[PDB]
Structures are given as structure tokens and as C-alpha cells.
Amino acid sequence: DLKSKFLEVYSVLKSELLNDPAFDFTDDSRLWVERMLDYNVPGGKLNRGLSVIDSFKLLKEGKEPTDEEIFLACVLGWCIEWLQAYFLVLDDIMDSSHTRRGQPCWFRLPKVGMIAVNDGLILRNHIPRILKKHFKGKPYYVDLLDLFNEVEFQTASGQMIDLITTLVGEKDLSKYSLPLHHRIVQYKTAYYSFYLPVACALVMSGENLDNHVDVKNILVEMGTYFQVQDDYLDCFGTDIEDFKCSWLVVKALELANDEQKKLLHENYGKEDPECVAKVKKLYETLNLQDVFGEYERQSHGKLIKAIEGHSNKAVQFVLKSSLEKIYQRQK
């Protein structure tokens, strides 16, 4: 129903981009861009993109959204998926990764290499082209541009602190802390994964985003909790191997004794299954599955009370639906 229409809208947007009047395409560059698009953009699960349409429908009370609206919401969802693909291509380059969704990373294919860097740029610059094409006549056009620019800035800044914390500070693991993890996760994932889709739906609904700081705070907290879920599922996956500032290692560094904190310092993300076995058993000995369960339900309580504090029924429906889609997930 909606998902099929979303993929159809992908085909529409790709056609428009490959007939863009701002660039003089030839067969070579048109085929290059179309292969790059098909390899990097539509292959994911597209949850963030479709949540735009979901949120827009719930904010239109319990009524029917029209046809234009459905198309527009799909276009904004695809803008979010384009943003994510743009970040992922460059992240795979920076992480020297090999595989994504079971296929080689874009930059790993022999005819691309570091060209993929520029491809990342292309992906990002497709978002204005799309927006201009479908929202230039709308009165909230500039709000869209400001929203996407600010969320992109925040995601890049979160990636920066993740990079510097890890690669520039794996001397002392003491560095990893609970506020540092919270900040990294809030800026790198929460704004674009949870705030941005609902903010798109709100802007389309005619709302001023400056009157919805409550919604933004709640969604940022919910995204932090989502990424904690991700950190937990990576181990219970190469976070330990990659010396990442995971929630699990941070909680372990706060709950262990001097001997177990010595164990962590002397076996964290330093190659070999050996080293990765010791970390997992330290996690078991501290019973980090019960700490994560307690954190999980406690966060759930926080979020539901905060959500029921809001004065708009549709907003409550949106936030409650977002929460239950991830509550006690295994994937």
C-alpha cells in the first residue's frame, strides 16, 4: 500500500535527478549517477523514510490524508534516506569497512575507489535538488532547508566527536564515560533517526518547529535509548574489536572492581577472539543484561510520562507509536 508507493516515488525522484537542468549530463555521467543511486540509496530497510508518512497520518487526527500529501511525505522520507546513504558511504570509507547489507562497500568496488568520496557529496547535494523540485512553491520551504541543514550539521558533529574520542583517545579508556557516550549518540544518531522524520511531518502540517521543543527533547531521549538498544544487541558485531565507546563497556567500567577494570583496559578492542572473549565474560559477570533491562524499562517509564505530559493528542499518538516500534526489540 504505502511502502509500494514509497518505492515508486524513489523511481520518480531518480528520473527527475537524472534529468536535472542544472547539470549537463552525458551517457557516462548519467549511468554513473544511476548505478551509484541504485547501489547506495534504496537498498536499506527504509524505516526512517516511511516514518515520515506514518507520523503525518497520525497528526492528521483520525482522518484521510490526500494524494498530494502522501507524495510529498514520501519525498521527504526519501530525502532522509538520501541523507543517511550519504553519511554511510563516507563512514564506510573512514572505517575501512568491507561489507554492507551483504555486498561490498561502495568504495570497495574496483572501478570506484576514492571516487566514492565525491559520490558522497553528490548524494548530499541531491537533497536540495529534490526539495527545490517539490517544495519550492510551499510556504514552509525554507523551514525544510533549515531543518535538514541543522540536522546534517549535528550528525557530522556527532561523528566528529565519535572519531576523536575513539581514534584520538584510545590511550586511556578512562576517557569513555556515560555523558560522553550520551553526547556522541545524541548528536550522531538521535536527531536524524527520530527527530527529523516527525519534524518533517510537523512542518508539512503547518507547524512552527520552535513551538515543539518538547517533542524534540522527547525524541532525542528516545533515540538515545534506541542506540543503547543497538549497543546491547551488538554483543548479545564488532564494537569491542573496534574500540568503540559502547554503552556496555562504559557501564562495565563503572560497575567493575580494580581487577576487572584492569581486565577491560588490557583486553578492549585489540584484535583476536581471545581478547573479545574476556570482555564478553566480564559483561556476564557484572550481570549487564539485568542492568540493561533496568535501564530499558526505566527509560520507558520516563518516556511515557513525558509523552503523556504533552497537550496535543496527535503528538502523543506519534510519540507513543515511535516508542512501541522499538520497545523490547531484538532487531
Added chain:
Amino acid sequence: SDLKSKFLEVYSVLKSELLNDPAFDFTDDSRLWVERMLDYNVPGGKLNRGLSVIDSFKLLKEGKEPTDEEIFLACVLGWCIEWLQAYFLVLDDIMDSSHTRRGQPCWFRLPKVGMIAVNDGLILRNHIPRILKKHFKGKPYYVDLLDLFNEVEFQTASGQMIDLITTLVGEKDLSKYSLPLHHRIVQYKTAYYSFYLPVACALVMSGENLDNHVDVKNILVEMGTYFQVQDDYLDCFGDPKFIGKIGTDIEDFKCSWLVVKALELANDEQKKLLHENYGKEDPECVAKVKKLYETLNLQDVFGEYERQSHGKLIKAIEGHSNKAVQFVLKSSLEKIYQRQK
């Protein structure tokens, strides 16, 4: 100079504002990181594109003295152009596996940076909206600024794409290289951001609608194409002391204007000579290619191209109905006509 010093003072102001940005939770580490990256990559060049914004705005302000506030806003737009260029240059140095820029190691070459520089490029680009929002959000031409910068960035990235896939992908047949492909690469990769964008910023500040200045855009794009032809010529026949570096376009198998004109002017033996020497590093082949350029008299062909381009541009410029616009375009032309650096 007076205005260059004021321009660098405006850089300091913009950097302070960016390091106190309310949209991000800075700590000592990331604030020092962003400041070390900004100072290393943004203010160290010649800032010609940035300062041309102020020059163009003052030329368009026929008759009525610009305020200090207007000069500051023009400086801000010039710095946005320099930020865009810095972002592109950081990523280009990564893609080209370069080693040094302006006599110092490339940002990604420093041991504590490496591939972090990729994300640093992103940071640089996303500084441009932060700056614009900070200083122009209340202006009625704010959205025109955003559209201008987004579209020029799209066109620059696309020009880089066709340059990369022309040079790197496929086999390395030198036949593909042609004059239309060179024109397309050069127009989209350099001309829009180096020549159109500064003047367009000055025009937007003047209250103009850019949709009524397509002629200006055409003239500036053609002028930027001519500028990059000059750069291609000087990369081989220029002076390394005056330019700053030694040109390696022949080694790097670039779709230069010189090799294209050589392939259109040579005979079968000289085109085979070109096929068997262009694009390898060792100076024997480079010297054969350069002396072929000499025997083909590519210097005099370039001189004739330059004076034909000058005549064309002068005629097109004097076709325009606004004298201030004509002054802007002629000032842009005479700064580069017969330049040596």
C-alpha cells in the same frame, strides 16, 4: 591591505561564533579540534574569490556609500565562498592522495588526522548554513542565498564527478579527451564557484533577482572557462617560482586544454607519440610531450585563443544594459587577462 585585514578580522569573528554554536554541545576537545582544522584549512590561501565579493558589491553600489554593516555582510559571504572551497580542497586532496598544499602537509596527511579529514570536510560544508543563518536569516533574500550556494555546490561536485570518471575509470585511451568534454568539466568544476558565485552574492546583496541576470551568469561561466584554460597553459609553461608549485598535468594524465589541442593539431606519428608518453611519471616522456607542445606552437595557439576570448567577452559585456554590471564584469576580466600567476 586595508580590506584584506578587515576580511581576516571577520574570519576571526565568524570562527568565534562557530565555536560557540548553540546547535552543538562543544567540549574542550571538539572545540580545539574544530579550531585547529579551521585555522589550518580556511584562512591560509589568497582569498581572491572571497575579496571579490566586497569588490563587486562596492562596484554595484553606484553612487551610494556602503555602510560598515554592508561591508561586514559582504565579507561574510566571501568567507562562505572560502569555506566552500576549503571543504572541496580537503576532500580533493584525500581523493588525489596528495601530499602538500601551500607548502605544508595536507590536512589528512598529518598523523593525528588521517581519514578523520573526510568528516572534517563535512564539518566545513555545514559551517556555511550556520554562518548564513546567523547573519542573513532575517533578510528577504535569505532563501536566494541558500538556493545559490546549494546549486553552485551541486554543480561543483558534479564537475568533480565527471573529471574523476573521465580521468580514472575506463581504460586510459587518450582519444576520449576532447574540447567539449574539457569545456564541460571546467565549466562545472571551477567556473560557477570561482566566477559566478562571488558576483552573484554581491548581486543578491544588492537586492537583485538572479533569474533576471542569466546573461551575467553566461558571461562569468565563459570567463571562468577561459581562466581555467590559462591555468592549464601555465601548469606547463608557467614559472614554478611565481606560481608556487611545479605542474604535473602531463604525469597525472589530466584532460588539459594543451593535450586536447595537441591531439587535434598533431599528425598520426605525433598522436602515437602522445599516446605512448602522456600520463607516465618519468621526465623523459614528460620532456617528449612538452617538446611536442613546442613544435606544435601551442603557445601561439593559446595566445590567439586568449585574444579571441578577450574580444568575445568584451563584446558580450558591452551588450549589457547596466553600467555597474559592465564595470563588475570588465574588472573581473582585466584582473586575469594575460596574467602570469
